[PDB]
């Protein structure tokens, strides 16, 4: 059954056919246990580590590979058995690297933590119901409670079901909701009907919902729903909900898979119509089966230069130490991927408790009386420091410090905070900070007592626990506190009876009595004005709620509470407390101390952070579950408004934003920048109209309500003050709760953004020219100028290093005073492509070059032979044409040799133009970035050490160039400087 809050409490008991005395029956739980089977929240199971693996291999590009692997692993096959230990180097460092990126995918992605295992730790074990089989209460687990079961809850325990009340066996009920609402502070709960059924779960006073806990009282209640249909399942079914979200980055370059998957295989066939014909006349040059052989030596090496191997393993590289300098500024990055994003967000959404306030109450101002004269009272407004429930704090009146000891009417005041109290304060040992007992309103009276020491009580020297309550205990050693008259609804307050200890005979019984200021001094005929007391006057009376209508309705907007009490209270005897009713009667000719305000206080770097993002272009909208009014006094606090700002149609409540039109909401979600009373279904449905509009989106949240809008979102961010559950559901955790991290781990993202879409294009534009080089070479004819093993060398060892040294890359300094970047726009640009293609056709024809360089210059290899050099595959000998040259020249190690010093060093002064995109080198000199020349030192070295090394050069086919080689590979292969800088030229001085 639902919305049952809007029907009376005999309606849903007569839905039922239950009796609230007796419950429910045996015979009718195993009848409504089958239709709604047991109370729990399903638990999702996450993906193994052999299922993630697969998906890895299932991209287009990666099967590309392995169809290269195989491949090359049958082509290893054939070879002669000589040569079999270098033949089988090419399958297994493909098959290698197939491997490892696999994983590398893998380990990236992965989240090894579960949102609704920590959803599920607010299911209570046990639950307290009346059955029929027993004439008194049952203690049965949650899982077999049904629908229409009568169940009781007390003080402590956790709400088992969603529960529609019945009876409130105690004066008042309180609950705790922060699991749906987000806020720590006590509802009162009625039995009363609710109308409205659009009414959001605030709005209803009648209803237990799942997951909660009771801060006070008891009562009884059935149960409307069940399982998945509370309102905590209604939380996990947004949990389950995955749509396998992907960074633009990674949104791109698997979009990129597939655009260049397609130019491989045109590029095969490409090669395929210059084959000349095996079936017709190729001199007969092998079998049937040797004509195929050379098309899959084309496809494997065109597999192996188009394909970009590596990649993954700079960009996770880069990652990983982008985590690592976010870790040092106590943000801990739980998906790699995600320190990416956070440099695109264009808006920032963030929830108000906990998150942009420190979820702890302090009282922010407090007055008393000074003087009267006629009907006029002027008052002495004080104000009091510090953000959290440490007491610690210095009080100040009219922007002068000063010490409350002197003060009588702020003695009596703090007596009666102190005094009449239900909470109390204590000190984590484990968490180090202080911590709440009780209510968080009464909790920020017991720390202003601590914090304005009335009595001078020496605080030094005493112990961190001491110096909690040391101030309250003073208090309790001189008043005893008799009893106390509970808070009812009707009167909005409570008092305690107190009578002295030390002045036995001297003094006489008083009653402190705290509330609502409306219903409190309409209650007070007097005023107390230091220790004397003088009779409320129309005048004073309109003056004192003056202050305090400006105190909650004004910018400040703090809840107050009016602090009374009574000289002559009425005798023990003649009060009888078991009606609640009279307690209001009992107080009565009250005389006014003061009122204190409280509010909970923004975090110290918010509203800095605020103005950052608004430099940034990144805007920031509060979605909370508190009040409106609330709500848009944080929000001018922190500067997400102006104090003079109109609010009107820039925030909305849950009610109100469902109850618009789509249309109407779209425009919302927009130009609205608070949202308050805010259902969690609704801080998903929020977001996900933000990424309806191409927005790029974060949010952070402390709570579990905040779950689904921080799974929902790409990128998540969660306090480490918050729920485990918050923690599980973002990518993101701030340690030391400070919110300045998140303008720095933007300004950390966009800084890596730059540098990887620069090696990116590093990397990129080296596998085009590889590409162009085995591609010329089969048109042409020529014998082998790169072997595949060679290329994947280039491809991770050579180009890997200077490579990763991109990401190191120098950040701008005005960085942050750009706005986000397009999330579609394309990683190259028009002349962008072409500045690459046209470098990528220069390197191609270098390293084909120095191959016919070798051969045609004649100086250590033969003479000039053109007709020879295409047709080398027509060469055996005894025949002519070929007469002076040996035929074995063209499997020497010396013309493949040429080409690799020419690859790897073009691939040094690319990687030297990659430092910045339209500046020139002399203006950006190239040690500006150190760990890049170090990059070039070690790849230039490393391409040493694989030709004298004594194993290397057999399988990768090299020998050293001696002096002369060196010369020409340095001076054909140093253009591509030049080349380059022509090209950023007129992009620079004229393009653009
Ligand atoms: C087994 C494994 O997980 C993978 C791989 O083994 N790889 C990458 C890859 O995902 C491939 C890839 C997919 N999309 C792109 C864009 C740009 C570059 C690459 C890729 C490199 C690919 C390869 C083969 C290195
Ligand atoms: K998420
Ligand atoms: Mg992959
Ligand atoms: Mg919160």
Redesign the pocket.
């Known amino acids: 059954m639902e919305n049952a809050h809007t029907k009376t409490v005999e309606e849903v008991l007569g839905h039922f056919g239950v009796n609230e005395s007796t419950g429910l029956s045996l015979e009718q739980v195993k009848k409504l246990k089958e239709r709604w089977g047991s109370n729990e929240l399903p638990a999702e199971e996450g993906k193994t580590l052999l299922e993630l693996?697969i998906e890895?291999?299932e991209?287009?590009?990666?099967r590309?590979?392995?169809l290269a692997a195989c491949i090359s692993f049958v082509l290893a096959w054939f070879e002669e058995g000589e040569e079999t230990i270098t033949a089988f180097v090419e399958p297994f460092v493909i098959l290698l690297?197939?491997?490892?990126?696999?994983?590398?995918?893998?380990w990236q992605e992965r989240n090894a933590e579960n949102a609704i295992e920590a959803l599920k730790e607010y299911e209570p074990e046990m639950g307290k119901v009346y059955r029929q089989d027993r004439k008194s209460v049952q203690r049965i687990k949650a899982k077999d409670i049904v629908p229409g079961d009568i169940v009781e809850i007390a003080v402590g325990d956790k709400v088992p079901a969603d529960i529609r009340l019945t009876s409130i066996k105690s004066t008042t009920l309180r609950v705790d909701q922060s699991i749906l609402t987000g806020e720590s502070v006590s509802v009162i709960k009625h039995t009363d009907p609710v109308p409205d059924p659009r009414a959001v779960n605030q709005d209803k006073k009648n209803m237990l919902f799942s997951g909660t806990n009771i801060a006070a009282g008891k009562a009884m209640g059935v149960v409307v729903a069940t399982g998945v249909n509370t309102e905590i399942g209604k939380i996990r079914d947004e949990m389950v909900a995955t749509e396998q979200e992907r960074t633009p980055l990674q949104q791109k370059?698997?979009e990129?898979?597939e655009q260049?998957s397609k130019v491989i295989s045109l590029i095969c066939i490409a090669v395929w119509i210059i084959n000349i014909g095996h079936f017709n006349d190729p001199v007969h040059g092998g079998s049937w089966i040797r004509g195929a052989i050379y098309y899959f030596k084309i496809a494997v090496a065109l597999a192996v230069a188009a394909?970009?191997?590596?990649?993954?393993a700079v960009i996770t590289t880069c990652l990983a130490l982008g985590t690592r300098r976010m870790a040092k500024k106590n943000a801990i990055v739980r998906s790699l991927p995600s320190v990416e994003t956070l440099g695109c967000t264009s808006v920032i959404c963030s929830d108000k408790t906990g998150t942009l306030t420190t979820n702890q109450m302090s009282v922010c101002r407090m007055f008393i009386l000074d003087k009267v004269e006629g009907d006029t009272c002027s008052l002495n407004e004080f104000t009091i420091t510090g953000s959290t429930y440490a007491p610690i704090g210095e009080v100040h009146k009219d922007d002068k410090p000063v010490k409350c000891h002197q003060y009588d009417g702020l003695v009596e005041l703090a007596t009666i905070c102190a005094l009449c109290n239900d909470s109390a304060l204590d000190y984590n040992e484990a968490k180090g900070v202080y911590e709440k007992v009780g209510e968080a309103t009464e909790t920020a009276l017991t720390c202003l007592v601590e914090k304005m020491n009335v009595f001078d009580t020496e605080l030094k020297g005493l112990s961190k626990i001491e110096r909690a309550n040391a101030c309250n205990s003073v208090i309790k050693q001189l008043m005893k506190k008799e009893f106390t008259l509970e808070f009812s609804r009707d009167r909005k307050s409570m008092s305690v009876y107190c009578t002295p200890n030390k002045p036995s005979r001297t003094s006489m019984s008083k009653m402190f009595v705290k509330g609502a200021p409306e219903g409190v001094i309409d209650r007070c005929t007097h005023i107390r004005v230091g220790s004397t007391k003088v009779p409320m006057t129309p005048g004073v009376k309109q003056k004192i709620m003056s202050v305090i209508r400006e105190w909650g309705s004004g910018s400040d907007t703090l809840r107050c509470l009016a602090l009374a009490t009574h000289d002559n209270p009425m005798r023990r005897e003649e009060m009888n407390l078991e009606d609640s009713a009279n307690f209001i009667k009992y107080e009565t000719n009250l005389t006014f101390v003061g009122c204190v305000g409280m509010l909970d206080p923004p975090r110290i770097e918010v509203a800095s952070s605020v103005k950052l993002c608004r430099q940034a272009g990144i805007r920031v909208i509060m979605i909370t579950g508190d009040n409106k009014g609330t709500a848009v006094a944080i929000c001018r606090r922190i500067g997400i408004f102006g104090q003079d700002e109109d609010v009107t149609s820039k925030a909305f409540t849950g009610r109100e934003f469902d109850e618009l039109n789509p249309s109407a909401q779209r425009e919302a979600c927009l130009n609205a920048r608070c949202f308050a009373r805010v259902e969690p279904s609704h801080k998903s449905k929020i977001v996900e109209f933000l990424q309806s509009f191409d927005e790029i989106t974060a949010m952070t949240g402390d709570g579990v309500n905040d779950a689904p809008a921080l799974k929902k979102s790409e990128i998540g961010i969660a306090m480490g003050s918050g729920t485990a559950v918050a923690k599980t559901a973002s990518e993101m955790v701030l340690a030391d709760d400070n919110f300045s991290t998140i303008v720095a781990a933007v300004e950390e993202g966009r800084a890596i953004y730059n540098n990887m879409k620069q090696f990116?294009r590093y990397?990129?534009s080296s596998n085009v020219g590889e590409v162009v080089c085995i591609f010329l070479t089969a048109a042409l004819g020529f014998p082998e100028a790169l072997i595949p093993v060679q290329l994947l060398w280039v491809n991770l060892v050579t180009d890997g290093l200077p490579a990763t040294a991109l990401g190191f890359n120098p950040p701008d300094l005005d960085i942050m005073n750009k706005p986000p970047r397009n999330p579609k726009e394309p990683l190259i640009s028009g002349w962008l492509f072409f500045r690459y293609l046209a470098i990528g056709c220069y390197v191609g024809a270098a390293t084909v070059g120095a191959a016919a360089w070798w051969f045609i210059a004649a100086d250590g290899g033969p003479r000039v032979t053109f007709y020879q050099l295409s047709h080398f595959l027509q060469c055996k000998e005894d025949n002519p044409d070929f007469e002076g040259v040996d035929c074995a020249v063209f499997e020497s190690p010396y013309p493949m040799t040429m080409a690799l010093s020419v690859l790897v060093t073009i691939e040094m002064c690319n990687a030297l133009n990659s430092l910045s995109e339209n500046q020139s080198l002399l203006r950006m000199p190239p040690w500006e970035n150190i760990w890049l020349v170090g990059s070039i030192c070690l790849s230039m070295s490393l391409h040493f050490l694989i030709l004298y090394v004594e194993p290397l050069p057999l399988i990768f086919q090299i020998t050293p160039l001696n002096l002369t080689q060196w010369l020409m590979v340095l001076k054909i292969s140093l253009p591509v400087i030049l080349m380059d800088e022509t090209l950023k030229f007129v992009a620079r001085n004229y393009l653009e």
């Open positions: 693996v890895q291999f991209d287009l590009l990666v590309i590979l392995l690297i197939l491997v490892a990126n696999a994983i590398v995918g893998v370059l698997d990129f898979g260049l394909i970009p191997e590596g990649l993954p990116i990397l990129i």
